[PDB]
């Protein structure tokens, strides 16, 4: 598999754009590329499909802010 | 613009119960105040009147337990 | 009890607005007291507090145009 | 612009199987291809992309059954 591409691909399709995902390390939130109803699909998307529960207060705009650091964050939680 | 006394306001209204604003420690869903259906129209009056989005799939009756304990759970939200 | 003062209390309460308690002719959707979200909001209170169940398809923005005409809908229903 | 290949292909991602858009009248809740963490991300996306709302307490896996149905139930919703 390819983890990275895995949460791109959620990225672009909750996103609607690919550019998301030709760009991972585009502001997300600055780009209003992802509203406060995408980031909550996003991170049920996430529970559903990788089995990670991240709590909508434990979600960071600043940290989560490109898809690159997403891909990150989520690492870094699983372990 | 008292957000908690606005956030109590709105329980009594959707639980039809003044005493969930005049007892802010009860048990909401412990006491039967509030049921599945109840739950879903308190979210979407958050949402339209905080702004507040709140996922039903994180809603939790443990943690959401008490109007105090809503309301300290909408400020969380609320900040970063 | 009155059903009236019920439903246009409610009204008020979805609608964040006195207006439309003081004004049961009022056309709530051309002024923009109520969106989507407060109509969904609204159906909801309605089935939790009166027990009738208005589905959303069976909802008109032209039908329901006012409180007044919002109760009298909701009479219908019933009967 | 095709709606009910989009719904399809909406039904798909979040089901993550593609048997839902290749079979447009597969029993979705009946094959247990989805649950209800599923359905509620699933109303997320039909607001985000479509602008429509589904309440999910009008949401009924007897009448949303299958991936026409579906189609079929949020184009009424569409309309008045």
Redesign the interface.
């Known amino acids: 598999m390819d983890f990275k591409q895995e949460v791109l691909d959620v990225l672009a399709?909750?996103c609607?754009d690919d550019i998301v995902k030709e760009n991972p390390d585009i502001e997300i939130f600055e780009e209003g590329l992802l509203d406060?109803?995408?980031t909550?699909?996003l991170?049920?998307?996430i529970?559903?499909?990788f089995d990670i529960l991240v709590?909508?207060?434990e979600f960071?705009?600043?940290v989560w802010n490109t898809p690159n650091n997403i891909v990150n964050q989520l690492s870094e939680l699983k372990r």
Chains 1, 3 share one sequence.
Do not use: C, K
């Open positions: 399709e909750v609607q406060s109803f995408g909550v699909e991170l049920l998307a529970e559903n499909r709590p909508i207060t960071d705009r600043d």
